[PDB]
Structure 1
Amino acid sequence: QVQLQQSGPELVRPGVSVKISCKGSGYTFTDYAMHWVKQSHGLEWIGIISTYSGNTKFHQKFKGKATMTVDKSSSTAYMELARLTSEDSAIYYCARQGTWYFDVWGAGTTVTVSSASTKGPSVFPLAPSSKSTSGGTAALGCLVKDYFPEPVTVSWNSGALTSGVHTFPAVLQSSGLYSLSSVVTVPSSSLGTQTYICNVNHKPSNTKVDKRVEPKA
């Protein structure tokens, strides 16, 4: 069905350059002009490219780096930012232009500008104990420590567990690496019987991890 599908998280050294994709699926791609937007961390329009003609208009401030292509045969719009600085670290949205407003948006692509090498998390358990129970419900979780760059995604039991799950925003540590927490609250009676995985995916380092969170007396 209708869906704008953007490239995954990118990490690029200062100075050099990066291109990101935005494939319109489920609909005639040429019928709709495609925009781009930069959520610095607040939206900021970058510009337009007509899937049909190929001409473009830009936010002044982005002339110099931002440049847009389309490949009609794959139904994919492309944006390229150049001379990359820390200012360019952000999430970049592609939003199809609808009749009356921006009507479909991509999930956005995360661009972290840094000369550093990718780094996949360590996953440590936050086991449920009496120190984590109240009213016959116990808290448990995973600690996704020391990765780079953002983002990681966490799920529980390959998506089958979703009530009671809190996945906290990542915190930047003093080392310059990220670390976040995902917890789920479950009934104390389920421990021992109903196992719990946390599934961590860090696409920039090609890291998948399942971690089983076992209780303690």
Structure 2
Amino acid sequence: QVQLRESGPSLVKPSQTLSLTCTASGFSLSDKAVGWVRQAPEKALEWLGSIDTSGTTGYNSGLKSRLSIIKDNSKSQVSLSVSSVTTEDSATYYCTIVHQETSRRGPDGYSWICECSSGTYTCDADNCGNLCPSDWQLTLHCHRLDSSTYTYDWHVETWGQGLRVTVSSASTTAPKVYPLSSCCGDKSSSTVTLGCLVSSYMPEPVTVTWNSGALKSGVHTFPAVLQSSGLYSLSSMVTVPGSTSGQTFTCNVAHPASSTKVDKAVEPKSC
């Protein structure tokens, strides 16, 4: 149960500092390097930086002057700081465990490393061996590795769920949640459909569940429309076998940007 939970503000004003925290659990930061990745809307994944078990930070060369990463092993927390953000820093920020090691791969085919008294060679055979003593075997089966030649290995081992951050000067707006119910005369089912309209909020995201998560199947939450007003709206729908008399339906809406949570009772239109 290796877990990576991002935390921080979902809304930040332009030219301020964006500060995020990643809490690690199920593993120690003294044994695993962790880094930050982000994806802005409609853009590709972008590397930000990492901090390894030794505590050495490394950053996207084109963003380093704006980034700062530090960790606290005892708390198993790692923080990210992005200074003087603009709307281009709006993105989902992912905490990650990254593999990082400096290697020395020679030409393709010379996999093994052979460092003798005469220097460092990349060799094709895994014996080091008959090659080290002989001058003729080295030039045959090995390439002499220059001091500068180094290779780098990087990949993401584990991904966090990601935290969406919006950079905007606009104020927040808590959603107004309206029940969705078909008109009378459409009560003939045989499956009854209802939902909730999460209207006019700012910023994203919003999460929707039904009956406090006890109602799983039959639910679908649509992506949000962005009115020209700058406010978002989305709908969540649940389809359930009818009749369902003797059961209630409540849509639970969470808008973390304003610490507000709404539980709206949805009752079918009785006529």
Q: TM-score range by the shorter chain?
A: over 0.9
**Counterparts in 2 of 1:196-215, with a 5 A limit?**
196-215=249-268
Task: Give me the whole-angstrom Cα distance separating, in 1, the residues matched to 2:97 and 2:27.
Answer: 11
- Asked whether the equivalents of residues 129 and 138 of structure 1 are also in contact (C-alpha less than 8 Å), the reply is no
- Asked whether the equivalents of residues 12 and 114 of structure 1 are also in contact (C-alpha less than 8 Å), the reply is yes
Task: Give me the whole-angstrom Cα distance separating, in 2, the residues matched to 1:169 and 1:84.
Answer: 26
Match of 1:83 in 2: 84
Match of 1:60 in 2: 61
Q: Which deviates more, 53-62 or 72-81?
A: 53-62
**2:65 aligns to what SS in structure 1?**
coil
Task: Give me the whole-angstrom Cα distance separating, in 1, the residues matched to 2:188 and 2:79.
Answer: 51
Task: Give me the whole-angstrom Cα distance separating, in 1, the residues matched to 2:251 and 2:173.
Answer: 19
Q: Rg larger in 1 or in 2?
A: 2
RCO higher in structure (CA 8 A, sep ≥6): 1
Task: Give me the whole-angstrom Cα distance separating, in 1, the residues matched to 2:97 and 2:75.
Answer: 16
Q: Report the CA distance between 1:18 and its aligned residue.
A: 1.3
Task: Give me the whole-angstrom Cα distance separating, in 1, the residues matched to 2:19 and 2:76.
Answer: 16
Q: Report the CA distance between 1:130 and its aligned residue.
A: 5.4
Once the two structures are superposed, residues 34-83 of structure 1 have per-residue CA deviations (whole angstroms, 9 ceiling, x without a partner) of 01111112311112211x22222211221222211111221011110111
Among 166, 169, 173, the residue aligned to 1:112: 166
- Asked whether the equivalents of residues 9 and 151 of structure 1 are also in contact (C-alpha less than 8 Å), the reply is no
Match of 1:173 in 2: 227
Q: Report the CA distance between 1:87 and its aligned residue.
A: 0.4
- Asked whether the equivalents of residues 68 and 82 of structure 2 are also in contact (C-alpha less than 8 Å), the reply is yes
Distance 1:128-1:161 versus aligned 2 partners, 3 A rule: farther
The AA in structure 1 aligned to 2:167 is V
Once the two structures are superposed, residues 65-123 of structure 1 have per-residue CA deviations (whole angstroms, 9 ceiling, x without a partner) of 22111112210111101111010000011111258842222211111001122211000
**Counterparts in 2 of 1:131-170, with a 5 A limit?**
136-170=190-224
**1:97 aligns to what SS in structure 2?**
strand
Matched, 1:102 2:104: no
Q: Report the CA distance between 1:193 and its aligned residue.
A: 2.0
Aligned residues: 215
Distance 1:131-1:175 versus aligned 2 partners, 3 A rule: farther
Distance 1:203-1:30 versus aligned 2 partners, 3 A rule: same
- Asked whether the equivalents of residues 33 and 50 of structure 2 are also in contact (C-alpha less than 8 Å), the reply is yes
Taking structure 2 as the reference length, the TM-score comes to 0.75
Match of 2:30 in 1: 30
**2:229 aligns to what SS in structure 1?**
coil
- Asked whether the equivalents of residues 9 and 150 of structure 1 are also in contact (C-alpha less than 8 Å), the reply is no
- Asked whether the equivalents of residues 35 and 46 of structure 1 are also in contact (C-alpha less than 8 Å), the reply is yes
Once the two structures are superposed, residues 143-192 of structure 1 have per-residue CA deviations (whole angstroms, 9 ceiling, x without a partner) of 001111111100000011111111011121111011110000112201x3
**2:243 aligns to what SS in structure 1?**
helix
- Asked whether the equivalents of residues 127 and 215 of structure 1 are also in contact (C-alpha less than 8 Å), the reply is yes
- Asked whether the equivalents of residues 65 and 81 of structure 1 are also in contact (C-alpha less than 8 Å), the reply is yes
The AA in structure 2 aligned to 1:82 is S
Q: Report the CA distance between 1:129 and its aligned residue.
A: 3.9
Structure 1 unaligned spans of 5+: none
